[PDB]
Amino acid sequence: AAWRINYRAWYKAKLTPTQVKTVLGVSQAEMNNVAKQLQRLYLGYYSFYTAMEKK
């Protein structure tokens, strides 16, 4: 759909699959750091809420 249009532009641009894999893997790594952030956000609030409630 949108992706066939993507593949045609990548192919026109002389991209090989190896090249696309290395760039997309870096994107994927950045995405996965967002999961880590939402976890840290949650645990931080869990601790904050608990600390507020105690006092």
Added chain:
Amino acid sequence: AAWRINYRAWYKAKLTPTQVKTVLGVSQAEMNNVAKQLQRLYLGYYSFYTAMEKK
């Protein structure tokens, strides 16, 4: 830091940890879809490239 300002706001808003966890959980699932879409993008290009190189 930034987050601590969020926490004070969430706490003033009466959010509990259980409530935050479930809302963040659904958002987390959405982000997990992106990494998977990128893996699918890589895989679909490998197939498209491989097919184009057939001709």
